[PDB]
Design a protein around this ligand. Structure first.
Ligand SMILES: [Mg+2]
Ligand SMILES: [Zn+2]
Lengths: 402, 157, 50, 1340
DNA sequence: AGCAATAAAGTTTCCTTCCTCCTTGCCGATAACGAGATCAACTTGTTTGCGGCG
């Protein structure tokens, strides 16, 4: 094929065919004369050498090159190594209806949601849009669809909103180690160029928010739509198949919020008085009358369903920190009160989750988790939280030991 | 000569410019004052100007690496002009049936000449021989059908 | 050029699926032989196959 | 201080007395090319080394010869700037002295035959800037300096190769600088073997005969003679006492009359003492001691001539008898202390088949030249060539020198060719370590690695061209006429240029320059490799070199080399690193004498140090005594430990010498993890300058030096006073004493305004200077892109306080206000370059023209008449730039477009458009155009317009120049008329030219009118000649490729500010993404209402331990207050003496900081400007390890009247209540980067494809589709979703029918599927059958 | 409004047509120089199979 400035580009195979042909034709010409045989001998050794060198250059005898000192690539390496069809071009594939961008966080979100910069999905759901403009009769045909589209009317965005609800997608970090390296989320449009993302699934992806990039793919058809909604959707994929473990761990922050709350000082104030329920601790602390971290007696109403799957209501009083009182506000009607009576190390929360799932089923655990995130981030912000040079501790008894 | 696929007097001129340009670069002792090429080879400027194309531009290969080791090849960086496009044939067929939509109401032959010439890619005056009217009327009705299909709106202008 | 590596007679005309007289062309009516020049015709894009 | 330094001072807290000011930093490239070009007479390098090396050439007969003399260069036609503009390489001519001498072949040497001593042009070559680069074709580039292993000799031993043995195998290697390598080695069974350039194994001894040696002499050299003597029946034998050492007695070892060692008995050291003592060598012994011994020398019957036993053959008693009979009462044999003296040669020998020399040469020949007939002389020639021809072999006496040291000779020098003695010494040294004596050595030791530089490369390449020449030169010497064939008739100069131009364009090393920031260039220029030719590779090379070696100390920075596959390989030069003259390294050290550190220096090697001891700089000097403390941590032996005080020889200079400059500049390195420091400085180069140049406050001291030697800025060439100033240039007038007499002495400076980087960025220069002001030499006169007042400025300093906020700082993510975008103060520019060319077709020429068909005048409205846009405009994707058009042929249409023409009726010309247009997604501002057109062609009108406006520019510039110059000269041309009378006002009132005729006296003064006219005519002559030259050079057309008519080229401009996704960090690896911007009003704020800028995540302080960022943060809050206290005073307008005291005390804080300052020196206005600068904040130097202390941070903070820890009460913007705890607050100085949000994003629905296989592409540039790997498959398999992957493999990848009909169904609302088969499958099938196979398929 | 006539104008065909150029094949004029190498690769490396190789 030719180039801009008339130049050409070629496949080397051709060259190899040609030499063969020349030699053979020579051999015919020679044979027509019955010539002395030695010439024939040389002619055919050169023949077969040309032949196999076509097949695979530097295997038997040393390889033929161009002027560059580089081989005239044979057949075999259409098929071989990574470069071959199998491993390059056949199994791993370039794709349309796809894209990528940088990521970030949506904390407030719900797990199943995912941030979309506008113009991306705008481009991506193009033929749907066109179907709907010929449907409504705005774009009676295709052209005016395009033209209003590149004019970007308000109806355009309205119609996108019409579509993309319930219109899920696939998202991908590289490299894919285990099957959770991809998931199946549901869109939410956002005004930027950068994706927001639910925090907790940094770990399924091994992601850190310091310059990642991800790609996005599409269940165009319905089968895949429903599979992804049913299978790779975030609610489904919360325990390892390797070991029956919650993989949804709150790593580092919200843990701290809870630990700071669920804690028992002695020092501050109000030590050892009496209440009806947690709603009065809300009354007080939102007025700022009590240390949340203070053991004080109150009354609680705990539930169990020790009957044949039927609840058993009871209530009683507890010398407990106040944060535990609040944190009972959210527990979904199945648990004892021992659950909170410690200052909640990481694994306590692991078992919080486990047990909740073990007995009460699934979606309560999910919501429980979500609200744990919201609330612990809230009180983490409330927390007052930093470090200094002066928080660094040197024991006085190091120099003498040395 | 068998292996090369370019003509001969080409290479005569090439050897000649080589001799001359070296000879005269020795005469002068410096380079690139092409008017010297013009005079010494007093034929024309466009002569060597074209020859420069004709000779000095050679073959290159397809799969060579793209430089700063093997990011991609030259087989990635390629462009084409003769592509497929889906809606032009689509609306072409729409307009074909619109031609029918116009001309089915019109004289017996002209619908047929324009059909069977434009539909299955047959012969035009093949019918001019059938009627034997001189195609004056053919011309006229061709024009009127144009005037009738300047009665619709379609982009792809 | 004919009788070479790109002898289009065998592999196919670059003038993609054109006949000799140039009546039938370019994938349009595949199972038509040019009734004018009597050239039996195949290979639009079977320049990828033959 | 200097004037520039008086402007703005940066404090210090360093405390150690510095000796040295840093050198000129990039001296080395300058040196190398300087010495390469320079006409050396004798001490040859580069050029003359090559010429005098290929000292003259004679014919295939030997009849005639050309002769070298000497050379010279020209100067370039074009200046720099035209070259970069024009699009051309910058180069120098070459001019050569030569003498074609011929001598009469009738006469013996009748030299007077013919002499043509003429001159010779041959080729241009490129030259260097004062900065370092070579521009090529208008492209600034850089080559790298290399490292690799020396030539010479090398020893090693592999360990259990045939691991069944688990045995050592020693071996030796020889590597000439040029020519063939060579390998000697052992086998599992203790025999010697050899190979050239890894030829097959061969016995060594063959070659020894091939070198005209007999076995007798062989073992004479290698072996000391075990002499028996046959005294009339019995065996006696000579003995050295220390041969029987650790050995056991075969019989009754005794004396003539005295027993020393009984049977079975080890010859202890006692008996060695007895035997040396009592004076015995000749000892009676049984005849049986022989049988098993080997004859040393082929002993015969002298009457017969019969080998009774061939040499190197075991001995016996029947042979004893026959030999005793022969008249041999003495038998030399080999010694075999297999412990020490093993007869490895004897073994290797009697494995060897050959005896004659000739057939040995033959067998070597037939090995290396297989099949070819064994012609004697051919083998002789082969052998001589491989090691004894100057043509194809050399050492680079460095090789010779290193080798002689490895020989333990004395003589540094030698030849470029081997000797026999030397080789023999190789053999014995190899066998000696094989016995044990001595050792093999290492690779990482830098003492074995030599660096390699530009001039050497050029040397090699052009001399290659010289050889290419010499070929045909000889070809025609022997044959043609001699009288008439001029010397320069014979030659060509293409190939030389080809070598030069290629590796300046083809080598891996030659690289674009990294124009992002000053650091980028200077350091990328100091960057070192072991790759390319004569080097190594990633996959083969392993860990051994990547790691650290102790000798790197103070030569190489350990803390700057990337994270990619090329981790440890490339590594930057150290600070005060220098090179040995050879290509080795060196580093300065302070001598320690009598305990006193002598203030001298020595640049000491990578070898020498292992002998001596070094003192450390963190050591506290005892103030003109010695090192205070006893156990000083000194170092030697590839290690460190604790030594006394008197003991030391030498000391380092600084605490810094190890690091890179990129490493050196973050302060408080002394408080954080290494890998953090790595990534910190690694991204530190990768920044972007803002619009503006904001300083830091927390420094190290060096920023000025790099600000200087980057060479970006204006400079004070020569002192003066500012003459003229503007937004584009200045003029200076030069001081008198500095004004040497010849020129009128006025520098000027046209500046570089908005200009493009190769990373596509806004470049510019600006004054930081005023008018009517003095100038000292050297100082700058205008800033560059990213600096201020001779100090680096590559980020901005900003407020921050750190705590969680609502999950917007989950993992290091960042959150900020929004005022800063009002200030646009991280906003920057990305100007983009674009072109469009006219060409001559086969048919005819492309044309450029406004008129094009089917055009809306909306498009055209912005174009001139030739079809070109008006400057200053603002534009968008789809817009058109260049009405380029193309004369075309014809087609055979079909009734389809026939009828589109019947309908539309827009006539197709014989021409199409080929216009330049804005790419999709882009919109911006035009500000400049250029055009290039050939010599021969009419210059398209606006190119004439611009050449004309350029003439207006140029002539105006030169007019200005000469007008000023001659305005100076009119001073004389008035004044000297005053000499010789007075027309006090009749001079001046009447017109000035008409002064010559005024009062006119004879004697000397007619000449004075005459010389008046002379200078006038001289001056107008300069004017005209200058116009001529310059106007030609501008008007001179262009040099172009074939087929080209002319080109246009365009620039653009677009300006980028923040949208989230944007990356940033500080100087500590503290990376960061933005998650949101904040309105001010939800921002946390303070007692006094000031909200904050930036907010942060403190979970990741200890996790990686980037702790120093804290320290500056205190300081980041700290010194600010001072400026506020001053600005408070300022707006209050207090009093000078208040400033005086307050400032002096700001500087008068520290205990023992070295700098100490007074200001009663300085004047009032100086205080005013200084204060007026400082109002924003007081900047400081934190030296790296001689840093400040917590005493001092809290000292400044206590003057600043604040929380000592500086961690304080804040209230919420959102709700307006206090947080729980105080929080540490302050300022960082931080950055932005080029991994930007717009640079990276891409989507794709549908577009282009491949052609061979019709599947999509990749790349945002080419509207790329994304890849879907097998890993992603395996996952999908894990879930088990068939239809999904089915789809993406069929329709979104290959199946074309599939993609089509699915698109159809979608727009129809139909979300359904139909599959096919991939084409790529059948492609595989066809490859298979092409390979000669009946691949096929079984139909259902 | 439908239908034709005369005149004019531009053609595509198209075909020769004779200038000119251009390209496919052949054979020729003194006499003798040297068997190539030519500018490369740096030896990854561990495991495994098979031919020798005793
Ligand atoms: Mg990351
Ligand atoms: Zn046909």
């Amino acid at each position: 094929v030719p180039l801009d400035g008339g130049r050409f580009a070629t496949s080397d195979l051709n060259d190899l065919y040609r030499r063969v042909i020349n030699r053979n034709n020579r051999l015919k010409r020679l044979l027509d004369l019955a010539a002395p045989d030695i010439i024939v001998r040389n002619e055919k050794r050169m023949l077969q050498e040309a032949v196999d060198a076509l097949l695979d250059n530097g295997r038997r005898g040393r390889a033929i090159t161009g002027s560059n000192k580089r081989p005239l690539k044979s057949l075999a390496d259409m098929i071989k190594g990574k470069q071959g069809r199998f491993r390059q071009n056949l199994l791993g594939k370039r794709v349309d209806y796809s894209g990528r961008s940088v990521i970030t966080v949506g904390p407030y979100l719900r797990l199943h949601q995912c941030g979309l910069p506008k113009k991306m999905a705008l481009e991506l759901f193009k033929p749907f849009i066109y179907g709907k403009l010929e449907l409504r009769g705005l774009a009676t045909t295709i052209k005016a669809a395009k033209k209003m589209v590149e004019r970007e009317e308000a109806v355009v965005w309205d119609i996108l909103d019409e579509v993309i609800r319930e219109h899920p997608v696939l998202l991908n970090r590289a490299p894919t180690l285990h099957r959770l390296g991809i998931q199946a989320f549901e869109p939410v449009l956002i005004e930027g160029k950068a994706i927001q993302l639910h925090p907790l699934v940094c770990a399924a992806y091994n992601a850190d928010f310091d310059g990642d990039q991800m790609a996005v793919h599409v269940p165009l058809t319905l089968e895949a739509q429903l599979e992804a909604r049913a299978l790779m959707m975030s609610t489904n994929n919360i325990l390892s198949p390797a070991n029956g473990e919650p993989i949804i761990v709150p790593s580092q922050d919200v843990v701290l919020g809870l630990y700071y709350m669920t804690r028992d000082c002695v020092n501050a104030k109000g030590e050892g008085m009496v209440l009806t329920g947690p709603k009065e601790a809300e009354r007080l602390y939102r007025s700022g009358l009590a240390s949340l971290h203070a053991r004080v007696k109150v009354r609680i109403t705990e539930y169990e369903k020790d009957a044949n799957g039927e609840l058993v209501a009871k209530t009683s009083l507890k010398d407990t920190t106040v944060g535990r009182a609040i944190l009972w506000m959210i527990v979904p009607k199945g648990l004892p009160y021992s659950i909170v009576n410690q200052a909640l190390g990481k694994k306590a929360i692991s078992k919080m989750l486990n047990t909740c799932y073990r007995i009460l089923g699934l979606k309560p655990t999910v919501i429980f988790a979500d609200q744990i995130m919201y609330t612990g981030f809230a009180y983490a912000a409330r927390s007052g939280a930093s470090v200094g040079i002066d928080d660094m501790v040197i024991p006085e008894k190091k120099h003498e030991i040395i | 000569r068998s292996r090369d696929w370019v003509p001969r007097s080409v290479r005569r001129n090439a050897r000649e410019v080589a001799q001359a340009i070296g000879q005269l670069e020795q005469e002068l002792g410096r380079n690139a004052t092409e008017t010297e090429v013009a005079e010494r080879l007093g034929i024309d400027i466009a002569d060597y100007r074209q020859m420069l194309l004709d000779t000095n531009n050679s073959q290159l290969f397809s799969y060579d690496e793209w430089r700063e080791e093997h990011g991609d090849s030259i087989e990635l960086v390629t462009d084409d002009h003769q592509r497929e496009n889906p809606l032009q044939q689509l609306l072409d067929s729409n307009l074909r049936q619109r031609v029918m939509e116009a001309i089915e109401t019109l004289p017996e032959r002209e619908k047929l000449v324009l059909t069977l010439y434009y539909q299955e890619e047959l012969n035009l005056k093949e019918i001019g021989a059938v009627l034997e009217v001189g195609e004056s009327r053919v011309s006229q009705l061709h024009s009127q059908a144009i005037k009738r299909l300047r009665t619709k709106l379609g982009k792809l202008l | 050029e004919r009788d070479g590596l790109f002898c289009a007679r065998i592999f196919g005309p670059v003038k993609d699926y054109e006949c000799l007289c140039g009546k039938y062309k370019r994938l349009k009516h595949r199972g038509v032989i040019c009734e004018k020049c009597g050239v039996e015709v195949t290979q639009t894009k079977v320049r990828r196959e033959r | 201080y200097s004037y520039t330094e008086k402007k703005r001072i940066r404090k210090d807290f360093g405390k150690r007395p510095q000796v040295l000011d840093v050198p000129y930093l990039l001296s080395i490239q300058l040196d190398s090319f300087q010495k390469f070009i320079e006409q050396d007479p004798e001490g040859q390098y580069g050029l003359e080394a090559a010429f005098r090396s290929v000292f003259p050439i004679q014919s295939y007969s030997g009849n005639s010869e050309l002769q070298y003399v000497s050379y010279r260069l020209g100067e370039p036609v074009f200046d720099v700037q035209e070259c970069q503009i024009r699009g051309v390489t910058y180069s120098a001519p070459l001019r050569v002295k030569l003498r074609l001498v011929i001598y009469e072949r009738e006469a013996p040497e009748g030299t007077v035959k013919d002499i043509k001593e003429q001159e010779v042009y041959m080729g241009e070559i490129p030259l260097m800037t004062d900065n370092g680069t070579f521009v090529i074709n208008g492209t600034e580039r850089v080559i790298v300096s290399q490292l690799h292993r020396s030539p010479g000799v090398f020893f090693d031993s592999d360990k259990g190769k045939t691991h069944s043995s688990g045995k050592v195998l020693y071996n030796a290697r020889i590597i000439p600088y040029r020519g063939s390598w060579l390998d000697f080695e052992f086998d599992p069974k203790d025999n010697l073997f050899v190979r050239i350039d890894r030829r097959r194994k061969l016995p060594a001894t063959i070659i020894l005969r091939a070198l005209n040696y007999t076995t007798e002499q062989i073992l004479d050299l290698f072996f000391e003679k075990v002499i028996f003597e046959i005294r009339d029946n019995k065996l006696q034998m000579e003995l050295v006492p220390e041969r029987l050492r650790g050995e056991t007695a075969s019989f009754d070892i005794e004396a003539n009359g005295k027993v020393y060692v009984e049977k079975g008995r080890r010859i202890t050291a006692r008996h060695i003492r007895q035997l040396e003592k009592d004076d015995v060598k000749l000892i009676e012994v049984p005849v049986e001691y022989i049988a098993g011994k080997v004859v040393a020398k082929d002993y015969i019957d002298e009457s017969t001539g019969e080998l009774i036993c061939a040499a190197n053959m075991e001995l016996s008693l029947d042979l004893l008898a026959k030999l005793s009979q022969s008249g041999h009462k003495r038998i030399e044999t080999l010694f075999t202390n297999d412990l020490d003296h093993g007869p490895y040669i004897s073994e290797t020998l009697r494995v060897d088949p050959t005896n004659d020399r000739l057939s040995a040469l033959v067998e070597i020949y037939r090995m290396m030249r297989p099949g070819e007939p064994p012609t004697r002389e051919a083998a002789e020639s082969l052998f001589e060539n491989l090691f004894f021809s100057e043509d194809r072999y050399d050492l680079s006496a460095v090789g010779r020198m290193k080798f002689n040291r490895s020989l333990l000779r004395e003589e540094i020098e030698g030849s470029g060719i081997l000797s026999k003695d030397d080789i023999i010494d190789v053999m014995k040294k190899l066998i000696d370590i094989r016995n044990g004596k001595g050792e093999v050595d290492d690779i990482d030791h830098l003492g074995n690695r030599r660096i390699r530089s530009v001039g050497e490369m050029a040397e090699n390449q052009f001399r290659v061209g010289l050889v290419r020449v010499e070929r045909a030169v000889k070809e025609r010497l022997s044959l043609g006429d001699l009288d008439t064939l001029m010397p320069q008739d014979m030659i060509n100069a293409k190939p030389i240029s080809a070598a030069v131009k290629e590796f300046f364009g083809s080598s891996q090393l030659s690289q674009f320059m990294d124009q992002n920031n000053p650091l980028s260039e200077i350091t990328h220029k100091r960057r070192i490799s072991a790759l390319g030719p004569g080097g190594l590779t990633r996959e083969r090379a392993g860990f051994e070199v990547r790691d650290v070696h102790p000798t790197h100390y103070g030569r190489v920075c350990p803390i700057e080399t990337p994270e990619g596959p090329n981790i440890g390989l490339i590594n930057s030069l150290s600070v005060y690193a220098q090179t040995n003259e050879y290509g080795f390294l060196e580093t300065p050290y302070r001598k320690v004498t009598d305990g006193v550190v002598t203030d001298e220096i020595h640049y000491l090697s990578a070898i020498e140090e292992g002998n001596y001891v070094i003192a450390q700089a963190n050591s506290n000097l005892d103030e003109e005594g010695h090192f205070v403390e006893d156990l000083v941590t000194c170092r030697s032996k590839g290690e460190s430990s604790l030594f006394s005080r008197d003991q030391v020889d030498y000391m380092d200079v600084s605490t810094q010498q190890v690091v890179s400059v990129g490493a050196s500049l973050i302060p408080f390195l002394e408080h954080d993890d290494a890998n953090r420091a790595l990534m910190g400085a690694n991204m530190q180069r990768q920044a972007v300058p803002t619009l503006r140049a904001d300083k830091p406050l927390v420094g190290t001291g060096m920023e000025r030096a790099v600000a200087v030697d980057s060479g970006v800025t204006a400079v004070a060439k020569r002192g003066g006073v500012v003459q003229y100033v503007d937004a584009s240039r200045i003029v200076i007038k030069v001081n008198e004493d500095e004004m040497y007499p010849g020129e009128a002495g006025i520098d000027i400076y046209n500046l570089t305004k908005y200009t493009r980087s190769n990373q596509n960025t806004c470049i510019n220069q600006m004054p930081c200077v005023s008018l009517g002001e003095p100038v000292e030499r050297g100082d700058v006169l205008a800033d560059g892109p990213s600096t201020d007042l001779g100090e680096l400025a590559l980020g901005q300093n900003m407020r921050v306080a750190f705590m969680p906020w609502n999950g917007y700082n989950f993992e290091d993510s960042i959150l900020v206000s929004e005022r800063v975008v009002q200030e646009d103060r991280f906003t920057t520019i990305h100007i983009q370059e674009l072109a469009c060319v006219s060409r001559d077709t086969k048919l005819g020429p492309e044309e450029i023209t406004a008129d094009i068909p089917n055009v809306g005048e909306a498009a055209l409205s912005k174009l001139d008449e030739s079809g070109i846009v008006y400057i200053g405009a603002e534009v968008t994707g789809g817009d058109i730039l260049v009405g380029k058009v193309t004369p075309k042929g014809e087609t055979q249409l079909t009734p389809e477009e026939k009828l589109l023409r019947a309908i539309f009726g827009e006539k197709a010309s014989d021409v199409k458009d080929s216009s330049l247009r804005v790419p999709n997604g882009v919109s911006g501002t035009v500000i400049d155009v250029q055009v290039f057109t050939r010599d021969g062609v009419e210059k398209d009108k606006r190119a004439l317009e611009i050449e004309e406006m350029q003439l207006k520019q140029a002539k105006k510039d030169l007019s200005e120049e000469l007008q000023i110059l001659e305005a100076g000269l009119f001073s004389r041309i008035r004044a000297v008329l005053v000499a010789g009378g007075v027309e006090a006002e009749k001079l001046d009132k009447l017109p000035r030219d008409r002064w010559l005729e005024l009062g006119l006296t004879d004697e000397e003064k007619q000449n004075q009118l005459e010389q008046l006219a002379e200078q006038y005519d001289e001056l107008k002559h300069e004017f005209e000649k200058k116009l001529e030259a310059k106007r030609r050079k501008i008007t001179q057309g262009d040099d172009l490729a074939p087929g080209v008519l002319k080109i246009v080229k365009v620039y653009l401009a677009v300006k980028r500010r923040i949208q989230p996704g944007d990356k940033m960090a500080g100087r500590h690896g503290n990376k960061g993404v933005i998650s949101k911007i904040n309105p001010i009003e939800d921002m946390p704020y303070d007692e006094n209402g000031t909200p904050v800028d930036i907010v942060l995540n403190p979970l990741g302080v200890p996790s990686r331990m980037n702790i120093g960022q804290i320290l500056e943060t205190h300081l980041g809050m700290a010194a600010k207050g001072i400026g506020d206290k001053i600005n408070a005073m300022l707006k209050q307008q207090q009093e000078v003496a208040k400033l005086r005291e307050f400032i002096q005390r700001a500087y008068d804080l520290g205990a023992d900081v070295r700098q100490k300052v007074d200001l009663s020196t300085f004047s009032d206005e100086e205080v005013m400007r200084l204060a007026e600068n400082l109002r924003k904040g007081m900047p400081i130097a934190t030296p790296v390890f001689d840093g400040a202390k917590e005493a001092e941070i809290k000292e400044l903070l206590k003057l600043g009247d604040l929380p000592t820890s500086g961690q304080i009460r804040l209230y919420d913007g959102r709700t307006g209540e206090q947080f729980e705890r105080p929080v540490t607050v302050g300022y960082m100085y931080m950055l932005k980067l080029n991994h930007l949000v717009d640079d990276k994003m891409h989507a794709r629905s549908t577009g282009s494809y491949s052609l061979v296989t019709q599947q999509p592409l990749g790349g945002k540039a080419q509207f790329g589709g994304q890849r879907f790997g097998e890993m992603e498959v395996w996952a999908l398999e894990a879930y088990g979703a068939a239809y999904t992957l089915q789809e993406m493999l069929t329709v979104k990848s290959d199946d074309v029918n599939g993609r089509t009909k699915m698109y159809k169904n979608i727009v129809d609302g139909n979300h359904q599927m139909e599959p096919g088969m991939p084409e790529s499958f059948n492609v595989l099938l066809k490859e298979i059958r092409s390979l000669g196979i009946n691949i096929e398929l079984e139909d259902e």
